[PDB]
Amino acid sequence: QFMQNTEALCDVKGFAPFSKDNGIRIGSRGHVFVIREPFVSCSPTECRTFFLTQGSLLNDKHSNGTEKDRSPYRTLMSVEIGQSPNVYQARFEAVAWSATACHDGKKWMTIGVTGPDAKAVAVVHYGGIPTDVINSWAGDILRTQESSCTCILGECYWVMTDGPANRQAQYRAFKAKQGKIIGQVEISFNGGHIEECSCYPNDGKVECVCRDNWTGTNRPVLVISPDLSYRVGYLCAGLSSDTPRGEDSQFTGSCTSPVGNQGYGVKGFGFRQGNDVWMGRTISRTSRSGFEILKVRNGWVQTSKEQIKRQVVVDNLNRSGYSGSFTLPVELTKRDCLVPCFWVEMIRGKPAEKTIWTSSSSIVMCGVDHEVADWSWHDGAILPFDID
Amino acid sequence: QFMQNTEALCDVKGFAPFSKDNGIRIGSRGHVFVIREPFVSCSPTECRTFFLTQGSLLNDKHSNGTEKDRSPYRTLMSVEIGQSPNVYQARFEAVAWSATACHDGKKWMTIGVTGPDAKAVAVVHYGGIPTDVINSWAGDILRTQESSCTCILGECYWVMTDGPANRQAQYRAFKAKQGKIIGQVEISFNGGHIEECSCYPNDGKVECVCRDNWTGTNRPVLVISPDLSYRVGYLCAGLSSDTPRGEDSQFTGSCTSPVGNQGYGVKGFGFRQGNDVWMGRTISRTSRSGFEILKVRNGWVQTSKEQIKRQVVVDNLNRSGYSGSFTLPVELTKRDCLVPCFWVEMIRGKPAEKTIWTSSSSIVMCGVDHEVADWSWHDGAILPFDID
Amino acid sequence: QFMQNTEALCDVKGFAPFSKDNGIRIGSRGHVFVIREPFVSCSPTECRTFFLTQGSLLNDKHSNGTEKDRSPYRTLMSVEIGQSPNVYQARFEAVAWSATACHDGKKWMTIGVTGPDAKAVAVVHYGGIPTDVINSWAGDILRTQESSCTCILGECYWVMTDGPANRQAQYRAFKAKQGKIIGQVEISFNGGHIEECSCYPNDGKVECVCRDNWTGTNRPVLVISPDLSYRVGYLCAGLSSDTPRGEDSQFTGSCTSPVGNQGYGVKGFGFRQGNDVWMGRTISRTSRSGFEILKVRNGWVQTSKEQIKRQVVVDNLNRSGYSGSFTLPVELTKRDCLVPCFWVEMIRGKPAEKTIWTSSSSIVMCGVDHEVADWSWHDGAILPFDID
Amino acid sequence: QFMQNTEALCDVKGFAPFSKDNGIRIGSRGHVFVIREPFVSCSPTECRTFFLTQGSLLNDKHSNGTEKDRSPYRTLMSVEIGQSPNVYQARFEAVAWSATACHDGKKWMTIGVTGPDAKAVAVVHYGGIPTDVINSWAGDILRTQESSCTCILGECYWVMTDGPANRQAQYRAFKAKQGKIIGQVEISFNGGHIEECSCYPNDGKVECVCRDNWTGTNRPVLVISPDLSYRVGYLCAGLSSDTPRGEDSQFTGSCTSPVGNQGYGVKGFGFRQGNDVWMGRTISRTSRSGFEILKVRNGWVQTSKEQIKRQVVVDNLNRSGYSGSFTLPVELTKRDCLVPCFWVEMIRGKPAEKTIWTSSSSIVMCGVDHEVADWSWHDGAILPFDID
Ligand SMILES: [Ca+2]
Ligand SMILES: [Ca+2]
Ligand SMILES: [Ca+2]
Ligand SMILES: [Ca+2]
Ligand code: NI
Ligand code: NI
Ligand code: NI
Ligand code: NI
Known part of the structure; x- marks a missing residue:
């Protein structure tokens, strides 16, 4: 049977360690x-871990x-x-x-984008076949979330970008049933930039917290209804969660516009909690080091700086990286709500460290x-390795 | 339940990347x-990959x-x-x-040919037992397709050759139900040569595009009905798809006879598309390098040179090899037709490269x-290896 | 369906070898x-083997x-x-x-304790999710059994300790259904110490034989009823089974108090057999070497020294380690009772042996x-290894 | 459901290659x-391969x-x-x-014998537990078949020996249902020796062809009925199939007595075919080299030397070893009879070859x-290996 995924997201007071793969040490x-x-x-x-x-x-x-x-040579694979x-x-x-x-x-849907930068092809797989x-x-590196897509009532939703990495691009959200694309919509977002969306189901909609790689140090927020109507803006909270970003003191939030006048970014996530928000960010403002998660009162709807909870997951002396969202389905938890989970990538190797390689756990x-x-719960590998 | 596989093959406008195993790099x-x-x-x-x-x-x-x-020591094995x-x-x-x-x-049928050249034994396995x-x-290297056989309505069909590799041999098509051979037929094909057939189901028949290793630079075509009546000839198209072959300019097609007066060959494939044809071939005319697929208007039925689509899959700077056909079953695609797929082997190693070994991905x-x-999507391995 | 596990434990005359993993040799x-x-x-x-x-x-x-x-980096994993x-x-x-x-x-429940010593978090997983x-x-290394917990009628029971390793700590038993904690109880045990309980179901209760790391060379015994009423004391038998311990001659048993005035210990186990007891212990009194199992007549209820059976499992020339209890479920044995089983860890490496590492089989x-x-059935590995 | 295995064994004209594992090469x-x-x-x-x-x-x-x-350290394991x-x-x-x-x-039954030579313990496992x-x-290396046991109508049968390897020992056949021993019988066989029986079901009985390690160069034959009545003698055929043995010319068969006056032996097999017999043997009379299978007319019932078929499986230039029998169940073949199969072990290494190790494929x-x-289909490994 199809997963409904129409329930509200659970309101949570903290996050418990689920898994650690120790892949680089191994x-x-x-x-x-x-x-x-x-x-x-x-x-x-x-639950499965997917990786390139x-x-x-x-x-x-x-x-x-x-x-x-x-x-x-790049392929998508998965393990438990x-x-x-x-x-x-x-x-x-x-x-x-x-x-x-x-x-x-019923089955896994996977989208893999490959081919040339000017004319990439995104192949939808369902049940292990194309x-x-x-x-x-738009002829400029078609690309997508690098995290879980979202399925509601048997229809799966995801966001893609086609265009420049450092200025205005184009953004589309797609809808598929059983691996067949049955709808799409252009996201109108002038002055804004969307990459690498971290999405999850909440109250029968797809909520997404993305990456602005153009001028924003705050994160775009995109909310998609099943009929592909949408709301798009920025995460209201008066704390910024992209990297690089400025000091919290110097920052004033906006629900509508990029703030901070800085380029680049990192994939990250946030969870709505009624009108509050859990937001992840690197502890360092300048590098992908450390990881913390903050709950901000009324942070989904106001430019609030009222932090009510903070939890550190990776200390500031260790490397972090991308992070993303997913939910635990009701058929596993037996709950009345969808449980929010996140993962944190911990990058090791070049150029920051003296190796010929780069990987992550x-x-x-x-x-x-x-x-x-x-x-x-940092990576733990001792570099350099033999091949270095 | 048995797969019907009685549907028509889908008419397709291009081919999307399904999988890449990176076996040699790994x-x-x-x-x-x-x-x-x-x-x-x-x-x-x-879908599974089989290999020797x-x-x-x-x-x-x-x-x-x-x-x-x-x-x-040679054995057949498989992976996902x-x-x-x-x-x-x-x-x-x-x-x-x-x-x-x-x-x-219901189950996998496998045919493995082993034993001495003068008296080989082909063992039919069904459900993992002989x-x-x-x-x-005919006492001269009994051998078969090196690609998927074809099952229609619970009966499985394949083609074997016994005789010389460079002149007239003998060719038989077989039919089995539940691993038991229940029919066969001698293919009358004087002046023609059939090796390494690439077969697929289409409209309740088995269509095959094979390799002529005797004089032909065009490919034999064999169409088998469930009662083991058959039609045999050559791929009509006015472009040749074997390797080695001559220039397209110098080539005139034939529905009935080998053309080109050259020996040797490579396993390849073609798909009928109504009266049109998709045909694979190496980009090089002389070596197994590059791979392209061409759609020729009316190419199944006329000596047409009207190319309407071309897609490159491996550039001419990289090694290719054998290629073959299969279909995606309706129980996976939920389509009203059988989806055509192909694989391309990319050979690395000796004698063309300075290693002691030869393998492929x-x-x-x-x-x-x-x-x-x-x-x-070429192989990508860096030779030589340590053992070299 | 839930396992009842309400049957009596089987009365057994000896123990047969079940498995040996040879992990270090491999x-x-x-x-x-x-x-x-x-x-x-x-x-x-x-049956599965779990390990850190x-x-x-x-x-x-x-x-x-x-x-x-x-x-x-420490994680819990398992194999067959x-x-x-x-x-x-x-x-x-x-x-x-x-x-x-x-x-x-129905599903596996797992409890993993991680986090800082002052504020550890024990995460309950059920069906492969938290x-x-x-x-x-109590802010001092929350910790648990390091062996199988016990499920009766769909509710699972285990024991945890929080506090000092060498003097009075605090002890709690927990009850969960489908991964949700639904009850707990403080174990009142003044003058006693409980670590690393080895538990099993018997007649609809959870019987536990634990480790006293404070003053006792005899083992605590804890019996938990489904309503979380309990009985707590010491294993009555007039032979001690902790390590380190004194000579059997110098020892007089107690049902109520620690005896022997020695610190430290090792995880071990015992099985009630009506009023008798099977008890495991290292053969050495001072080191974790050898392993034997003794049946003592009336040893569960009296300070008996009447040994009626003895079986050696690891000779005194070889290293042993922790040991623990589990039962074979009726759905596997088809018996009218629960079959008692135990495992013995055989530790190799530092500091006792000259390697940089320590592991066990x-x-x-x-x-x-x-x-x-x-x-x-000792470990069998030849040390040192290459990395040493 | 239980396998009936009450059918007659199929009469076969030859043997087709099923599998080759190439384990040593790999x-x-x-x-x-x-x-x-x-x-x-x-x-x-x-079908699974079991190994020590x-x-x-x-x-x-x-x-x-x-x-x-x-x-x-010795354990029994298996693969496909x-x-x-x-x-x-x-x-x-x-x-x-x-x-x-x-x-x-329904489930796998396994018997593993371990422990000391004077007092070994054979543990019966059913469904993956003891x-x-x-x-x-008899206090002298309890031991069993080293090949498939035989199940008929849900009851499983096997043969064990306890006693000397080079003179009169004792022999028992056992019967189990669902891993519980429910019957046994002493095999009276004075002057005879039974080791390493190769057994198979035929017409509702267990037929066994074994190894005489005392004086016989012909093989014992043991036929067990479900009520544990039995017939015991020697394979009648006027050709000997043990190794070492004498020349065929010098040999006269016996249905009742060991012939040849030689010690030692090798595990082997034979299949009854009405009144005829298929018998395996090494090609060498003195060493475990080569392997052939011979069909002898009336060889099950008379001292016949009428060879009607011969098939070579391993040439005399390559090493063989033990061999044994099994059958393919009707639920796999869909036949009206039980298909006979055999395996041949090909031993490599010391002492015959200059390595520190010995293994087999x-x-x-x-x-x-x-x-x-x-x-x-010989082993194919190139010795010595690196460790040598
Ligand atoms: Ca940014
Ligand atoms: Ca040709
Ligand atoms: Ca103690
Ligand atoms: Ca003998
Ligand atoms: Ni799969
Ligand atoms: Ni299988
Ligand atoms: Ni799982
Ligand atoms: Ni299993």
Whole structure:
């Protein structure tokens, strides 16, 4: 049966550690893919970690990072949550240098974007075979979320961008049923920039907190209804959660406009909690180091600076990276609401560290009814490796 | 339940990337079989990649290519599509230096040919056990498709050759139900040569596009009805798709006779599209380099040179190899027609490259309702390897 | 359906070898986690071995034992009983430096304790996702059994400790249904110390034989009824089974008080047999070497020294370690009673041996209706290893 | 449902290659157990290869053959037929230095014998847990078939020996239902010797062809009825099939007595075919080299030398070893009879070859309705290995 996913998101007081894969530590000797962009998504029976590989293993010469990011070797694969991204437990999903995946209650849908920058092809897989495609509509690196898509009542939703990485681009949201695209909508967002959306279901809609790589240090927010009407703006909260960003003191929030006048960014996430918001961010304002999650009172609807909870997940002495959202389905939790979870990618290697390679491992946290103590579930690998 | 596979083949405007296994890159450090002849076939639940191994792994001394091609160590194994042919995910299928496999809706049927050249034995497996055999009828390397066989209404069909590789041989098509051979027919084809047929279901018949290793640079075409009546000829199109071949300018097609007066060949494929045809070929006319797929208007029925679509899958600077056909079953696609897919083997190693070994990896494409941009999903391995 | 587990424990005359994983021997070349605290628990279909890893493999530099025992890399994983704790067969369970696990007839429940010593968080997983949490209530290394928990009539029971390792601490027993905590009770035990309980179902109650790390060389015994009323004392038998302990000659048992005036201890177990008891212990009184199991007449209820059976499982020349209890469910044995089983951890490496690492392998024995000869199923690995 | 296995064995004209695992070749680089005594047995869904390991891998120092054959590290494990005995695909079965296994239609039964030579314990597992035991009854290396046991109508049968390896011993046949021993019988066989029986179902009885290690160069034959009445004698045929043996010219058969006055032997097999017999033997009379299978007219009932078929499976230039029998169940073949299959172990290493280790790989053949050409599916590994 299809997952309804029409329930409200649970209001949570903290996040409990779900999984830690230790992939880089293991890959010092084991056979582990060099990966990037490792997200989690769940079916009615299990949660899986998805990741992009280059067909190269840690401590092998092919892990040499002299390739294009968007190479023809790049594929999407998956394992059970908490398993390292190792060769012998991996499930193939799609050829892809950009991806999203989600389960509709019956089967996995996966979208893998590959091909040339001027004319990329996004292939939709459903149940482990190709079922449809979207070609680039604007001829400039068609790309998508790098996290879980969202399925509601048997229809799956995701967001894609086509255009410049550093100025105005174009943004579309898509809807599919059983791997067949059955609707889309252009997102009108002049002056704004959307990349790498982290989405989740809440009250029968798809809520997304994305990345502005143009001028914004605050995050875009996009809310999509099943008929593909939408609301688009910025996360109202008077604290910024992109990286790089300015000091909190110097920041005034906006519900409507990018604030901060800085380029670049990092994939991140936020969860609406009635009118409040949980927002993730790196502890460092300038680098992808540390990770904390903050609850801001009325932060979804006002430019509030009223922080009511804070939890540290990775200390500021250790590397973080992308982060993203997903939910636990009711068929697993038996709850009356959808439980919010997030993952944090912890990047290791070049250029910040003296290795020839770059990969990442992950920590995954889920929302609970209790406050949880600060700690640091950092990567733990000792670099350099033998191949270096 | 048995797969009907009685539907027409879908008419497609292009092919989307399905899978890429990166097996050779992975096998630089991981434990991956040295393989040859890697085809894909699908059941109602999944597609699998089949391959021939020697019981030797990449970067080990046993990968030393000093063996007979048709050795007693050669076996047929399989993995899920997109998985590298690695030891720890592999399913054993048959002892075999020539093979074919296909699913009838209920179980996998596999045919593995092994034994001496003068008296080979082809063992039919059904459901993972031996169920029947065919001994050599002409005493000269009994051999078969090296790609998916075809099942229609619970009966499975395949083509075998027994005789010379470079002049007139003998050709038979077989029919089995539940692993028991229940019919066969001699294919009368004087002046013609059939090897390594790539077959697929279309409108309740088995259509095959094969390899002429005697004098033809055009491909034989064989159409088999369930009562084992047949039509045999050559692919009518006024472009040749074997390798080696002549220039397109110098070529005039024939529906009935080999054209080009050249020996040797490569396994390839074609799909009928009403009266049109999709045909694969290496980009190089002389070597197994590059891969393109061409749609020719009326090319199934006339000696047409009217090319209406072209798609590049592997650039001419990279190695290709065998290629073959399969279809996606209706129980997976939910379509009203059978979706055409193909795989391309990309060979690496000796003698063309300075290694002691030879193996291959694969790219798999499936037909879609959209044109897809040219690109190159080439192998990507950096040779030589450590063992070299 | 839920496991009833309301039957009496079987009365057994000896123990038969169930499994031996040879994990350390295998890990000389294979890819095997460095582990600690490897317990067994069974579902209606299978028994599994659970273990704590650091994300490091044998013969790799990360196995270097310079880490905190309670590190952020420590996780709980599992394999089928008798499989080595290898990377490619492992199932992720929880982030954890202390753990317990058990099956309720429908799904696995796992408890993983992680976080800082002053404020640890115990996460309850049910069916492979987080469902609840218990934070430290006394701010001093919240910790639990390191063996199977016990499920009766769909409700699962376990014991935790929070407080000092060498003097009076606090002890609580918990009850959960479907991963939700629905009851708890403070265990009043002044002058006593409880760690690392080995529990099993017997006649509809949870019987536990634990470790006193404060002053006792005899083992605490805790009996929990489903309404969380309890009885707590010490194992009556006039033989002591902790390590370190004194000579049997110098020992007089007590049902109520710690005896022996020695600190430290080892996780161990005992099984009630009507009024008799099977008790495990190291053969050495001073070190974790050898393992024997003794049946004492009336030893559950009197300070008896009447030994009626003895079986040696690991000779005194070889290293042992922790040991723990579990039962075989009726849905597997088809018996009218619950069959008692135990595992013995065999520790290898530093500091007792000259290596940089420490890990363990296991032997598992189950109760049978026959006496079984003494032998030694010791670890068997030859140290040092290459990394040393 | 239980397998009936009450049908007659099929009369077959030859044997077709089923599987070849190439385990030693693979283990040059992959992670493969050093094994001995690799037999095959089948359930209603699949055939599996069972094998004894020492917890040591090929090309590792623990493969050093300085251990006792009957060591405490020795365990029984299994993989799908045709898979190498590799770590990451292996299923644990039992602690064992002697073993047998078979499926009753519902679950696997396994018997593993371990413990000391004077007092060994044979543990019966059913459905992956221990269910019963047999202790040594004669105090001298209790041991069993090292091949498939036989299940008929839900009851499983096997043969064990306890006593001297080179003179009169004692022999018992056992019967179990659902892992519980429910009957046994002493086999009266004065002047005869029974080891390592190869058994199969035929017409509702268990037929066994065994090894005489005392004075016989002909093989014992034991036929067991479900009520544990039995007939015991020697294989009547006027050709001998043990190794070592004398020349065929010098041999006269006997239905009742050992012939040949030679010690030692090898595990082998034979199949009754009405009144005829298929018998396996090494081609060499003095060493375990080559393997052939002979059909002798009236060879089950008379001292016939009328050879009517011969098939070579391993040439005389290559090493063979143990061989054993099993059948394919009707639920797999859909036949009206039980199909006979056999496996041949091919031993490599010390002392015959200059390595520190000894292991084996296998070829498996099944009976078919056609004659099959001679060939040699020998091991293929190139010795010595790196560790040597
Ligand atoms: Ca930004
Ligand atoms: Ca040709
Ligand atoms: Ca103590
Ligand atoms: Ca003999
Ligand atoms: Ni799972
Ligand atoms: Ni699948
Ligand atoms: Ni199992
Ligand atoms: Ni199978």
